[PDB]
Design a protein around this ligand. Structure first.
Ligand code: ADP
Ligand code: ADP
Lengths: 60, 82, 201, 350, 130, 86, 403, 48
């Protein structure tokens, strides 16, 4: 997200009724490892953040 | 004191089980765009799910996605015989 | 593991909405503006094909703007032949003028969805027909019309080869399907043995 | 800062959030121009909990904003309330008139039943909301009002007052006009309690005159009200007395609970909460408990909860919701309405 | 580090002695950009908190072992454009409250020699002539 | 206990002021009118509006300037509690 | 991004009429605010409350027989009462998006359209199938809508949003069968009794001991059909409360060892069914040894689904098996969805993906038709398909070519 | 091959609206749960 500095996990941008854009989310990998993944996007539980993903986290 | 710590931890845990976040901060996220860079440093844009756009021409050929469950595409070369 | 793909929704997820907090922070931010009047005004969609008129929530500033979604009504390209055109070119023995007209009406109504056509096809007024047969007839008529007016060769034999074989496969009994899987595994083992042989040489 | 205005039929309730009680309470009646008693063309626009005409509605909005209260609505957000079965068109029109006419910075519509549940401080239960013109039984689970399970009962304080008028007139008292209907309503709110086990209470009141109680009218007239004190509100449990053929409040609540999903009706029974001014009758809680225990299974642990603030419970809940910090992100910002229109009231709810 | 929300949960007086009013723990509500995390620190640090101007709404620099508090400054979120002051407002910290900062410094032996050679700290070293 | 622990409420995050003449982030605060502003044109228009207001009991109309798409309120009721210049 | 092509909300009072319960509500909303019994207390009283007050006769009758409306008078009465009481909206003020079964006759459809455009004068109308809406409710254009209403079980397949009328399989297995079997079981072990409709007050009763209570001296209610309906109410309560569907072939070795469960009848009579509470939900999937009809030849749920798939073209079966859409009231029974999934997996031919949509958690399956109707109504492109008053008054009044 | 017809876009819009409704239902449920839990916690905190 922009104002927060925490990774909300897997999400997708979607437009809703009234022109308002929503951001759906999903659950996987206990939903906790991604909250700590911020240390990999800003720059075991350390390599797992690099293996489960290809560091394709959306900036801003 | 140990019992108080235990009950406080339990109470805090209960709070975390309702909802972590519920807002999107429309101030910037609403209009701002999202981009990432893969391990190879390649750029890609975030595709947002918009409603069907108005077709201005005869493009957007019918795909029949339900048929793709068993078929993928049509190669150029074939057997080329009766 | 990898990223997730889902159409509607997963089990425990949750989506964030927009912000409306900190009224004190944004007090003057939104206090220095007003709201554009929204009116429950009547709108006429040109795609209605009639004189009916409905209502919709739109701002009073665009009393026009007949309808945005009106440009989505794209009709499928279905030729419209006359009686003489059928008598001269599309005449057939098994088929008849009324049957071809009914087929074309169903095609125009369902947008060339031959499956739904066959489903709703009137097997009473006309003897039973197959999906591949309807497709062949339609494509032949379209090709003849495009030729006389002055697209690709349709082969009913192919559909005659695809659907029955795929049906016989779908009807594979449990034991024979397991035997086919065993034969596939044995062929894979033979291929691995051949690979080992060619590598050792 | 955030205002709370509960659209309660009979009398409107408004005030500022954070307070333990509403500051402005007045009859929700408008005359065309004046919202006070008198010989005018007064008319009730919200008789049965649904706005009939929006002219008088906007008039009472302007009133409760500028005359009763002395706050500018364009500078403070308003927390509005709506019936549990408020139609879509009415909600949209309300949002429109509130964003355009008064230029409020933000607002939010909430179910009166959910507000009364907040006031009661319960996570689940059935809200037996009993206004002046309509009654509702709204089962709630994790804050969701379960709209399919909500049942509506079309009797309320107005019909009770009418039946009390009829009875006391049959007994020989002058209660046939509005000037006397006000005294009858005063009697109903102060006197006219509820007595459990009417089959025996009426027999005792007829055998012994100890249940007879005197009342003094403004004109010096004195009358004695007795066995018919609790016969009037008995219509709530036996609408046959009122003349209609609907189910009682307890029967309606039992039906609402039965319609609720299984595996949770236990918690519903365990949190049956009363709301509305029509539940201020002393002893009504015990009667409700007893009759529900009779109807509901014996193995079920029925528990009737009814704080002394029944009449204003909805306003207390609205104030609590407004003062709530987490609720601040749910306000319908002005820009949101401007870009989306009145349909925004639908989204960002519950 | 993070925005502080100081609060002292009242606790019964020292159980070894009599009765009265004591404080067995001091909870500090450090709020960082990623979230919030309250720390139930040792009560003896209360002296350090009162020493510096540690008021609710400022960023503090806590140390694990030492515990000394070093206020960085108020949060920029409160830096109203009409307030004229500098070096007093700092942005909120980015990342988890608990941060393990690893820094490496390469200095030649001569650098250490020079550093340990000359003095530092008072002792009237501010003189110019001599 | 109170001295060493002044348990005060949060700092009550301030308001994000905005220029009423240009609707941009206000950078200044007019002394006489006590209304934020960001440009010299905004300051001049604010001074003119304040003069028109103090002329009579209260300016019936409201000065308009840089009206965006949505209906601009043309804020007169942005009360300036400050008194006469001197 | 203004979202001009988002959607439109123009009235469209969806009215999903059902054999057990009728549903209604405005379009755009996610849950129908109107849900009451469909049977009317014909002496007409149609309401959750009015249908529970004793009067002279109050005969219960369901206008929809086999899912098909036959008594047009009672149907019109239900519609009028619903509007006036719950909606309070003028008839000719908002369109209507009533739903229909895949097996609606042409004459009955024309009569429904005539009743809509003549006595109500609604500004527009559109009659979509129930399976289509149930599919749209799940965002599926292709799938098997396994309807399990109170009077029929049908695995209707849909192709690109169009129902395959030839693929439907109207199996008699439905809620009515379960209720009849439960009534028979009760009559065998005890005596079925009326709900509190007549019970004045109950008392504490030892588990398994005869119950004692007081009888009310109200009207006798000679109409047995009304008594039958009041008993079916408690039967359905029992079904939805304790009745559980088996998870295997139901051998008489595991059921005798499972935990016991209790249930209290309206009069307080407490009894346990932990031994045979799963015997009744067996004919649904294995209608081969039901005590009611031992010499019958029916097809279970999995059998019905397999038949519905086979009767259609093979080109669409890959999209049918992979998108099975379970719906209807019977499905909310415990272990029903799991048993269905297991049976379909062991029956479906391997190599074909079989996926059961995860929607059993909530009770929204019943309201799936109304949800799909509201979704369809909220669309902008669909705003042109409505049958306007002009198309009807013109003289055509032909809903076949327009739907 | 053939171009997309009216129903081809209508079904896509239908799926979009369906997923929107699905997300909004859960959003409302989660918001209501949050509100009730926060209110009861505030009541307990006030009592304490
Ligand atoms: N002392 C009292 N005890 C019980 N009921 C009362 C009393 N005084 C008034 N009432 C009735 O209860 C109603 C409370 O009204 P209110 O709760 O504002 O209605 P709503 O629920 O529509 O807001 C009044 O309308 C009146 O008819
Ligand atoms: N003709 C019909 N068409 C579609 N759905 C129906 C029809 N008749 C009944 N239903 C649905 O089937 C359900 C039957 O309820 P039931 O299975 O007895 O409830 P439960 O088993 O959850 O207690 C109803 O909720 C109704 O929505």
């Amino acid at each position: 997200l922009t104002v927060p500095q925490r990774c909300i996990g897997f999400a997708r941008r979607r437009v809703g009724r009234g022109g308002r854009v929503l951001l759906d989310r999903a659950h996987s990998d206990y939903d906790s490892v991604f909250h700590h993944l911020d240390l990999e996007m800003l720059s075991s539980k350390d390599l797992s953040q690099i293996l489960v993903n290809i560091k394709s986290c959306r900036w801003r | 004191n140990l019992k108080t710590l235990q009950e406080r931890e339990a109470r805090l845990r209960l709070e975390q089980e309702e909802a972590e976040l519920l807002t999107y901060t429309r101030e910037d996220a609403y209009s701002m765009e999202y981009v990432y860079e893969d391990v190879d440093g390649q750029t890609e844009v975030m595709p947002l799910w918009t409603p069907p756009t108005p077709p201005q021409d005869d493009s957007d050929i019918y795909l029949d996605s339900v048929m793709c469950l068993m078929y993928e595409a049509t190669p150029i070369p074939e057997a080329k015989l009766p | 593991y990898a990223l997730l793909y889902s159409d509607k929704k997963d089990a425990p997820p949750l989506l964030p909405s927009d912000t409306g907090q900190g009224y004190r922070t944004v007090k003057a931010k939104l206090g220095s503006k007003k709201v554009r009047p929204w009116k429950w005004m009547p709108f006429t969609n040109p795609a209605r094909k009639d004189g009916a008129m409905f209502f919709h929530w739109r701002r009073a500033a665009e009393e026009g703007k007949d309808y945005p979604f009106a440009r989505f009504n794209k009709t499928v390209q279905v030729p419209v032949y006359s009686e003489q055109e059928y008598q001269l070119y599309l005449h057939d023995d098994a088929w008849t003028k009324a049957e071809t007209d009914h087929l074309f009406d169903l095609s125009r109504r369902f947008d060339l969805r031959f499956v739904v056509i066959h489903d709703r096809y009137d097997h009473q007024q006309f003897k039973k027909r197959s999906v591949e047969d309807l497709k062949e007839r339609y494509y032949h008529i379209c090709a003849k019309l495009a030729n006389v007016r002055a697209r690709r060769k349709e082969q009913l034999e192919r559909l005659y080869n695809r659907t029955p074989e795929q049906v016989a496969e779908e009807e594979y009994l449990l034991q024979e399907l397991r035997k086919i899987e065993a034969r596939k595994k044995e062929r894979e083992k033979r291929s691995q043995d051949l690979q080992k042989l060619i590598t050792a040489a | 800062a955030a205002l709370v205005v509960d659209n309660g039929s009979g009398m409107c309730k408004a005030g500022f959030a954070g307070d333990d009680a509403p500051r402005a309470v007045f009859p929700s009646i408008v005359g065309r121009a004046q919202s006070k008693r008198g010989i005018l063309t007064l008319k009730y626009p919200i008789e049965h909990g649904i706005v009939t005409n929006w002219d008088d509605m906007e008039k009472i909005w302007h009133h409760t904003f500028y005359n009763e209260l002395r706050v500018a609505p364009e500078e403070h957000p308003v927390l509005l309330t709506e019936a549990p079965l408020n139609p879509k068109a009415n909600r949209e029109k309300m949002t429109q008139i509130m964003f355009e006419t008064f230029n409020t910075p933000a607002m939010y519509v909430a179910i009166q039943a959910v507000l009364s549940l907040y006031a009661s401080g319960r996570t689940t239960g059935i809200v037996m909301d009993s206004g002046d013109g309509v009654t509702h039984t709204v089962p709630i689970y994790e804050g969701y009002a379960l709209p399919h399970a909500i049942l509506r009962l079309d009797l309320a304080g107005r019909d009770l007052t009418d039946y009390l008028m009829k009875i006391l007139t049959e007994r020989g008292y002058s209660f046939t006009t509005t000037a006397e209907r006000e005294i009858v309503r005063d009697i109903k709110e102060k006197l006219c309690y509820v007595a459990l086990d009417f089959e025996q209470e009426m027999a005792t009141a007829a055998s012994s005159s100890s249940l007879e109680k005197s009342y003094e009218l403004p004109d010096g007239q004195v009358i004695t009200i007795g066995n018919e004190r609790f016969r009037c509100p008995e219509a709530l449990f036996q609408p046959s007395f009122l003349g209609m053929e609907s189910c009682g409040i307890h029967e309606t609540t039992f039906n609402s609970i039965m319609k609720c999903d299984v595996d949770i009706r236990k918690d519903l029974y365990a949190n049956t909460v009363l709301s509305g001014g029509t539940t201020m009758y002393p002893g009504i809680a015990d009667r409700m408990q007893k009759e529900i225990t009779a109807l509901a299974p014996s193995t079920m642990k029925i528990k009737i909860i009814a704080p002394p603030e029944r009449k204003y419970s909805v306003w207390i809940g609205g104030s609590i919701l407004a003062s709530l910090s987490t609720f601040q992100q749910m306000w319908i910002s002005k820009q949101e309405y401007d870009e989306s229109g009145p349909s925004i009231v639908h989204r960002k709810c519950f | 580090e993070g925005e502080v929300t100081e609060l002292t949960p009242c606790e019964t007086e020292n159980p070894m002695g009599g009765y009265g009013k004591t404080i067995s723990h001091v909870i500090i509500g450090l709020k960082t950009a990623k979230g919030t995390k309250q720390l139930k620190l040792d009560p003896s640090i209360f002296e350090s908190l009162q020493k510096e101007r540690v008021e609710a709404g400022d960023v503090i620099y806590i140390e694990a072992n030492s515990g000394a508090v070093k206020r960085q400054g108020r949060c920029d979120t409160y830096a109203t454009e009409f307030d004229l002051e500098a070096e007093e407002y700092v942005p909120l910290p980015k990342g988890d409250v608990h941060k393990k900062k690893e820094i490496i410094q390469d200095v030649t032996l001569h650098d250490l020699d020079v550093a340990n050679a000359r003095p530092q700290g008072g002792q009237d070293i501010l003189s110019m002539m001599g | 206990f109170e001295e060493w622990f002044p348990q005060g409420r949060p700092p009550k995050v301030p308001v994000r002021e905005v220029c009423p003449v240009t609707h941009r982030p206000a950078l200044y605060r007019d002394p006489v009118t006590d209304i934020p502003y960001a440009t010299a044109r905004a300051f001049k228009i604010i001074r003119e509006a304040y003069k028109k207001y103090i002329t009579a009991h209260g300016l019936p109309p409201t000065a308009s300037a840089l009206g965006p798409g949505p209906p601009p309120p043309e804020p007169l009721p942005g009360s300036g509690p400050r008194a006469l210049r001197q | 991004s203004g979202g001009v092509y988002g959607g439109d909300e123009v009235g469209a009072l969806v009215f999903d009429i059902g054999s057990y319960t009728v549903r209604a509500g405005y379009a755009g909303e996610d849950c129908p605010k109107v849900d009451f019994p469909t049977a009317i207390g014909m002496v007409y009283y149609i309401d959750t409350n009015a249908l529970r007050v004793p009067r002279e006769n109050m005969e219960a009758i369901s206008p929809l027989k086999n899912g098909m409306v036959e008594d047009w008078d009672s149907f019109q009465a239900i519609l009028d009462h619903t509007y006036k009481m719950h909606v309070k909206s003028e008839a000719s003020l908002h369109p209507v998006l009533m739903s229909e079964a895949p097996w609606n006759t042409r004459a009955k459809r024309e009569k429904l359209t005539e009743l809509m455009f003549e006595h109500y004068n609604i500004p527009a109308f559109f009659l979509c199938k129930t399976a289509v809406l149930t599919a749209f409710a799940n965002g599926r254009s292709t799938g098997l809508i396994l309807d399990s209403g109170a009077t029929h079980t049908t695995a209707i397949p849909v192709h690109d949003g169009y129902v395959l009328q030839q693929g439907i399989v109207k199996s008699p297995l439905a809620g009515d069968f379960i209720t009849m079997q439960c009534r028979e079981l009760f009559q065998e072990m005890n005596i079925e009794l009326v709900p509190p409709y007549m019970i004045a007050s109950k008392e504490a009763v030892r588990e398994g001991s005869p119950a004692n209570w007081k009888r009310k001296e109200k009207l006798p209610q000679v109409t047995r059909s009304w008594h039958n309906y009041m008993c079916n109410c408690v039967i359905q309560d029992f079904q939805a409360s304790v009745l559980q569907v088996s998870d295997s072939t139901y051998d008489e070795q595991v059921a005798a060892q499972m935990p016991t469960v209790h249930y209290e009848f309206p009069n307080g009579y407490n009894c346990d069914f932990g031994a045979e509470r799963l015997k009744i939900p067996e004919g649904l999937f294995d209608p081969s040894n039901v005590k009611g009809l031992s010499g019958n030849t029916m097809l279970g749920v999995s059998h019905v689904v397999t038949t519905s798939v086979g009767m259609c073209d093979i080109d669409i079966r890959p999209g049918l098996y992979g998108s099975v859409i379970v719906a209807g009231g019977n499905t909310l029974i415990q272990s029903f969805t799991d048993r269905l999934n297991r049976e379909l997996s062991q029956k479906t031919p391997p190599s074909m993906r079989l996926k059961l949509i995860a929607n059993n958690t909530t009770v929204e399956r019943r309201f799936s038709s109304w949800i799909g109707g509201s979704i369809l109504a909220s669309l902008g492109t669909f705003q042109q398909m409505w049958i306007s008053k002009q198309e009807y008054e013109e003289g055509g009044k032909q809903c076949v070519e327009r739907k | 091959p053939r171009p997309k017809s009216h129903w081809d876009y209508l079904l896509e819009e239908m799926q979009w609206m369906a997923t929107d409704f699905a997300q909004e239902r859960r959003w409302k449920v989660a918001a209501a749960k949050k509100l009730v839990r926060t209110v009861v916690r505030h009541h307990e905190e006030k009592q304490l």
